[PDB]
Amino acid sequence: GLVPRGSHMRIALMQHTARPLDPQHNLDLIDDAAARASEQGAQLLLTPELFGFGYVPSQICAQVSAEQVDAARSRLRGIARDRGIALVWSLPGPEGPEQRGITAELADEHGEVLASYQKVQLYGPEEKAAFVPGEQPPPVLSWGGRQLSLLVAYDVEFPEMVRAAAARGAQLVLVPTALAGDETSVPGILLPARAVENGITLAYANHCGPEGGLVFDGGSVVVGPAGQPLGELGVEPGLLVVDLPADYLQDRRAELHRNWL
Template sequence: MRIAVAQTRGESGRIDANLALLEDRAHAARDAEAGLLVLPELFLTGYNTGPTTAALAEPVDGPSLARAADIARATGTALLFGFAERAGNAVYNAAILIDAAGTVLGCYRKAHLYGDEKQRFSPGAGMPLTAHIGGLRCGVLICYDVEFPEAVRDLALRGCQAVLVPTALPAGMPEIPGLLVRARAYENQIFVAYADRCGEEDGLAYEGRSCIVGPDGVVLAAAGAEEALLVADLDPAAVRTARLRFDYLADRRPNLYARLIV
């Protein structure tokens, strides 16, 4: 499967403008023959929206998500992007996965909240989102989630061959995409696609450096600090090849690690 990762600035608080940007990037992904487009954390609303976050939130069956489904259907491109989800009185930092036919495959709620997110969002229960897209079993995490090895290992043990990560990484943390994301791919022998925001939003600067990493830890595509569209082919055979020499998942001894889970 060919995947595209869009590193974008987005428009803070302007959902209509971000839907227009989504449509533009979906067309670009289609032109690149990518079957899936991954965009950043809270792409639909903007990330650094402070006290207006709740007002921008909408349910999974809301009008903006319906428009995104129309875009997926029109371009024949599956979409994964972040949005503020309203569910009753709760607001979640969420990511929605829509297939190329415009069908919602699932919604993931960020489990590990970072900084002021703890005041703006309820934490997700950690329920995994996995789906088959283009012959590849994919799992979804959001930003800070990928920095916890247990979260990625859980998806790998569920059979995921790729983990897709919308993110809004602040500037000054190049070791996250440069080191940690590569380690997550290597230690689980899976693909990891990491889609960051870039530029500034209401005084918050973003790192950028979005990347797609192979199951051998090799970077297949990487961005700098500016807007970019990354494209790479994710072949399930590469996962099998990585595990021929050694297989971290098969060689685990969980009985030795039980005390680590409390």
């Protein structure tokens, strides 16, 4: 609807099916979603993990060059500027195929990259064969009146990774993902706890449908700090648009915890 009285941030999540190794098709889908999110008055669009090349880790490592990644990244900065909306995307990193990770970056509505992050927790042997894990903690930055942070897919299933973002001040954690296998426990059990246990909001934007030998679950969702969904999709392509409205972070005995992991 109209932008509500108590809200000054409206975000959108893209859920769709990518075609493996067809960046012109996948980036056309992101441009469509960016235009539709901006028409509905959203200020930022979150898109799924590795969407521009499809979630095909082995084929990205074998077939996608650094120059082809940079061409998709330049197109995505162009979509943020041309559709006038901040955009979170996820691509392979910028180094050669043997030295890069899976990344997420946030561009503002002018197309400039505000923050970049490399996935720290790679999932399974295909990702670990195709990508280097990140070694830096999640970034946190002010945008739109709140402190935003980035994580990618499997990262959010580790409470440590969401605690690392909330310890640096995050209030809204944006998470491109690629979750297949009818893995109901991740959005149904873990995301609500990551929100409650830090008092944050998380946005989780998945693929859906048949892609890359998998059928992805959809179920994109935004979870607020009480653990309840502010909005959620089912299994088909869609664009979710949501208006955002114990002191664990202080109480935690972090100097003992860090010795006990």
